[PDB]
C-alpha cells in the first residue's frame with residue numbers, strides 16, 4: 061500500500077550512502093537490509109578502513125577517491141560521529157619488485173598528488189617501529205588516512221532517516237519482479253514496489269543476482285583482521301604512525317595505527333578462504349592462517365607491534381575476475397542499478413559511489429566516469 065520512488069536492497073557501505081544521497085533530494089526511499097547496519101555480518105566492520113588517493117588500479121579511480129574524500133569531510137561536518145582521521149597512508153615494497161608500489165608512484169605523478177618518496181633506512185628513521193630492508197622504497201601520502209566505517213554507515217543512516225528515508229531492518233530480500241515501468245521486491249516481511257531499484261547486497265550479490273537473471277562471477281572471500289597489543293610510543297596515531305598498505309614477496313598487507321591505545325590492526329589482503337556468506341565461519345582463529353599470517357608480517361616489519369592478540373574480526377571481500385567494481389544499470393532493465401564486486405577496496409569510495417548510484421537511479425546517467433566498472437565488460441566473464 062506504499063509505492064516508493066526508489067528501493068535500495070542492501071543498506072550497507074554503498075546502499076546507505078545512496079540512501080543518504082536520495083533522501084537529501086526529497087526522493088521517497090526505502091532501504092531494506094537483512095540485518096541492522098552497521099553490523100558484523102557483511103563487509104564493513106572491523107572499525108577502520110584506509111582511504112588513499114594515489115590509485116594505481118586505474119585513472120578513473122583517482123577523481124572518485126578525491127570526490128569521496130571531500131564527501132567524507134562533508135559527512136564529518138554533518139554528524140556527531142567520528143568519520144575521518146588524517147593518519148597519512150604509507151605504501152612500501154622492494155625497489156623494482158612491486159607493481160603495487162610502482163603503480164602508486166605513477167598515479168601520484170599523473171594526478172599531481174602530494175607525496176613523500178623515501179627509501180631504505182629513511183623509512184625506518186622517520187617511523188620508528190617499521191623495520192624494512194635497505195632495498196625497500198616507499199611513497200607516503202600525508203593527506204589521506206583512516207575512515208571509521210561503521211560510524212560512516214550509522215551517520216548516513218541517521219541523516220537519511222531524518223530526511224524521511226524508511227529503513228526496514230532484519231529483512232532478507234528473496235526475489236525480484238521487474239517491469240518496464242516499476243520494480244518489486246519480495247521478503248518474508250512483505251512485498252514492496254518502486255519506480256527504481258538499487259541492488260547492493262555485498263557478498264550476497266554472488267548468490268542473489270541470479271534472481272535478476274544475471275550470471276556474473278563474484279567470489280566471496282573470508283578476510284580476517286587482527287588487533288594486537290603494541291608499543292604505544294611507536295605505533296600510536298598520536299606519534300604519527302601511519303595507516304599502511306604494503307607489498308612484500310608473499311603478498312599485500314594493510315593496517316592502522318593504534319587509536320587511544322586500542323592496539324595496531326593488521327590484515328592480509330591477497331589471501332582469504334573462498335566461502336559462502338551464509339555458511340562462513342565468523343570466529344577469528346578457527347584457521348591457523350588467521351593469526352599466523354599476520355604475525356609473520358609483524359615479526360619481520362613491525363616487531364614492536366607483535367604483542368598479545370586482543371581480538372580479531374571476520375569480514376568478507378567480493379571479487380570480480382579483474383578486481384574492478386561493477387557500477388552500472390542492469391543490461392535488461394534501465395530502472396535497476398547494480399553495485400557489486402568491490403573486490404576488497406571499495407569502502408573508501410562508498411561516499412562517491414552513493415552519489416553515482418543516486419544519479420544512475422534518478423537519471424540513468426552519472427557525471428562520474430564509471431566506464432571501467434561496466435557490467436558488460438568482457439573481463440567480467
Ligand SMILES: Cc1cc2nc3c(=O)[nH]c(=O)nc-3n(C[C@H](O)[C@H](O)[C@H](O)COP(=O)(O)OP(=O)(O)OC[C@H]3O[C@@H](n4cnc5c(N)ncnc54)[C@H](O)[C@@H]3O)c2cc1C
Nearest residue numbers: 070072073074094102103110233262375402405406407408
Ligand atoms: C577485512 C576487510 C578490510 C577492508 N579494508 C578496506 C580498506 O582499508 N579500504 C577500502 O577502501 N576497503 C576496504 N575493504 C573493502 C570494503 O569494506 C568493501 O569493499 C565494502 O564494504 C563493500 O561494500 P558493500 O556495500 O558492497 O557491502 P556491505 O557493506 O557488506 O553491504 C551489503 C549489505 O547487503 C545486505 N544484504 C545482504 N543480503 C541481503 C538481502 N537478501 N536482502 C537485504 N539486504 C541484504 C547486508 O546485510 C549488508 O548490510 C575491506 C574489507 C574487508 C572485508
Ligand SMILES: [Cl-]
Nearest residue numbers: 377378403404
Ligand atoms: Cl568487497
